Design a protein around this nucleic acid. Structure first.
Ligand SMILES: [Mg+2]
Lengths: 59, 101, 87, 61
RNA sequence: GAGCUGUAAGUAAGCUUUGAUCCAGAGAUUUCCGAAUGGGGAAACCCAGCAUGAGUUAUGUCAUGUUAUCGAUAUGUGAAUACAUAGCAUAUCAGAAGGCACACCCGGAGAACUGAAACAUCUUAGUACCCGGAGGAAGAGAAAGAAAAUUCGAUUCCCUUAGUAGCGGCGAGCGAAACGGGAAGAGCCCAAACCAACAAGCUUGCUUGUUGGGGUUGUAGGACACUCUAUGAGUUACAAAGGACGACAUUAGACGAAUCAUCUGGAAAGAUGAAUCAAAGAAGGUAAUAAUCCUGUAGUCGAAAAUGUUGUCUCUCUUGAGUGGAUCCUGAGUACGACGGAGCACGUGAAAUUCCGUCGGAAUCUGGGAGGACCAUCUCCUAAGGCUAAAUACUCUCUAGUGACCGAUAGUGAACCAGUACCGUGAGGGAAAGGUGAAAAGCACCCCGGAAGGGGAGUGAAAUAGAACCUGAAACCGUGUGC
RNA sequence: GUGAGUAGCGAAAGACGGGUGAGAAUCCCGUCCACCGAUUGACUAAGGUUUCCAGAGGAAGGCUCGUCCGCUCUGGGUUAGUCGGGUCCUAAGCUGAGGCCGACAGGCGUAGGCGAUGGAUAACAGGUUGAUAUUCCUGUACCACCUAUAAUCGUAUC
């Protein structure tokens, strides 16, 4: 599906409690930002999460 | 054990105490055919080309553990053992020792 | 090459046209063109027309179990020179 | 028998392969249709002497 | 080692003592459909391209040979845009796909009726279904550990601890671990500090970019400083990877001891009599119930060959410690904290240790973590890289063998040619069937009949066992007769 | 088994003479009679898969009977350069190299393909068998391709 192209972080699951503890399920999602990362060939349009962008943000 | 051409001696049957010769051995059912021993009276199909209204009399097969191969040097049907220093098993009567054929 | 298994000599539609026509039972998978180059490289004659037809398997029943027979392709040659391609 | 009276010559394999396949078993299955129960045990033997002639040509590869 | 041609009965024509049939290993052939793979398709069929080859005076028609898609090494070659890069044209390539044992295992996702005598947190349950990955096993694994002794020294599985400590609308219910006894028991490779080269710096750097040497731990161990040894030590199951010579096991096979005569019988293995062998009296068959008739068993014995398991013989490869103390190193968006969830027996509870999403975010040996909030001294241990056999869970199968397990409405749905007749558009549902006799010797011939079916004569111990074929119960339909 | 030798026998015009046979209201042949006739008649699609046809059968099936048969045994039957399809074309739809999305499975879609119920597409009379006919053979045709060819035209042509 969708992953961080640098690290590899992705979604999760887990329940969703309430004030009376009824529990549906839900899904967590990595904060993925499209950015132009220089790799071999062309610097493509990739999917990178926003925690791997604090130092390694190439143009 | 028992093959065609050699004498026998029926030990257990309605026609016991009779010698003879082997005619043809069924190998799978372990049945041998001896002349003059357990003869039939077959109601033949008289519409066949050969005969004119009759009854055939051909011998019926007996099991191989009813005959017993004899060498009457001591007037006795014996059992068989095997000796070979010749590249081929020569059949031996254990109760007398002689080489039979 | 041998793509002519047997002839067939049945009552009228095989042996009551014997002035120029003959009837073989060819193997399947073959044309009517190959039979022109198969009854010529055996008997040394010169055909004029080859016709074919196909029969389905038909049902026989013996004992307590049914089965089908074998399907068969049938050819009918017609000569121009020479005669008596069966004896 | 037939099994090693063959290994006679390389060229005379196929010139006898075409001699028995084409010109013997084809005559012995036309004559079965027009009427012959004279030798219906030649059809097994001239077919099992084709298998011996198409086994030796694998040894010469 | 003499009969054979699957069911095989039945005839035909044959083959075999110049060793056939039958059995085991190894090679040969293995049409078309199938992941289907030249393109197409409603599986088992239809249409082609370029090379060599037959054929025809020549087209038409045939045979062999190849040609799917991604990936990644390559060679070209113009790229919108000069250089040049996504495209494109080819040579190669045991690379990949699908099938599964519906068993066991590890991950991703993941319910309900039900129990609580209703029901929602909870239990049923991280179970059933489904999807991905493999293996002969998989997973965990070489202490930032248990614990409170003058501590011992990876993990895994059984016994006990124990239905105890706990968690719980404190309801229903869920439920450990270390100690102690055992089965089994081996530990090792990188990163960094660094020394030497080769493409970019006078570059200031042996650090950076690549590749070889170095170097692995807590009693603090390595760079660097010093001497004292440099042949013994090997593994290719962890730690680097390439052959022979015969030992033993498996898939054919051979030898293998000893009973004769009478009575009843259709038949002796039976009872009555005498004999014998026994590392052999397990079992099956033979006209009835056999240690001695047959096939065999205890015991010896056997491999042209193709795998398989190990011994030692090669052959590859390799440095082993101690003391010093100045300097450099010892895994970073990492550990951890707040908000939201999951999981540990433990339901946010005072909640430790463990992982996930989001933002914040470190110290560097006088360091860092844990010991059930937290802080202070004593105590053990060294997180953020990786690879590891055995004890353990299974059985669709192949070989020997057992059973106070079944004996045709039983045991498999199935002892009969069974997932088959038959029902359904489809997924899917699914029964019924066994027995002549010791041997087919399975009723020649006469007679009533169109034939069936009978009655005599015959085979057989018995047809009152005739293929409606062993024994033949009751219900129910008959014909006869004493009251 | 009782219900019981009861309810049924599935619209509808038959009568007789002759044969056949162990057996006939039922089978075959003859004459008279009645019924449909915008159909109970004559050809082709869909679907079924040997039923079609000749010679022999009478245990089962046929709502009775049966010498009969769409039922049993043996032996036969379907012929194409021109008819309906394929080697030609595209609708709705389906599938899809790269590509774009999604816990996995997978969903969508561009170039290209597949897909007739439509467009294109060269043959008609007569004879014949116990069962086949624009198919087989009689007489005359036509479209595509190939080979010899002569009058040949030539920057002509494809
Ligand atoms: Mg699971």
């Amino acid at each position: 599906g969708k992953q961080c192209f640098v690290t590899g972080r992705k979604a999760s699951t887990g329940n969703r409690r309430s004030h009376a503890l009824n529990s549906t399920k839900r899904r967590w999602n990595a904060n993925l930002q499209k950015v132009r990362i220089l790799v071999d060939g062309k610097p493509k349009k990739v999917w990178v999460s926003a925690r791997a962008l604090k130092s390694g943000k190439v143009t | 054990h028992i093959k065609k051409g050699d004498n026998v001696k029926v030990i257990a049957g309605k026609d016991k105490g009779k010698e003879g010769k082997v005619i043809a051995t069924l190998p799978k059912k372990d049945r041998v055919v001896v002349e003059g021993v357990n003869i039939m009276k077959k109601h033949q199909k008289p519409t066949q080309l050969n005969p004119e209204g009759g009854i055939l009399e051909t011998e019926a097969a007996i099991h191989v553990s009813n005959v017993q191969l004899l060498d009457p040097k001591t007037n006795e049907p014996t059992r068989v053992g095997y000796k070979f220093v010749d590249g081929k098993k020569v059949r031996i009567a254990k109760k007398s020792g002689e080489e039979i054929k | 090459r041998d793509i002519l298994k047997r002839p067939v000599i049945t009552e009228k539609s095989s042996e009551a046209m014997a002035e120029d026509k003959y009837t073989f039972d060819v193997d399947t998978r073959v044309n009517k063109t190959q039979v022109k180059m198969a009854v010529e490289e055996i008997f040394n004659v010169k055909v004029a027309s080859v016709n074919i037809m196909n029969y389905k398997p038909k049902k026989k029943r013996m004992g307590r179990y049914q089965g089908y027979t074998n399907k068969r392709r049938k050819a009918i040659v017609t000569l121009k020179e020479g005669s008596d391609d069966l004896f | 028998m037939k099994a090693k009276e063959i290994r006679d010559l390389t060229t005379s394999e196929i010139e006898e392969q075409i001699k028995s396949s084409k010109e013997e078993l084809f005559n012995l299955r036309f004559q079965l249709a027009t009427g012959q129960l004279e030798e219906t045990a030649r059809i097994r033997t001239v077919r099992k002497t084709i298998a011996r002639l198409k086994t030796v040509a694998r040894e010469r590869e």
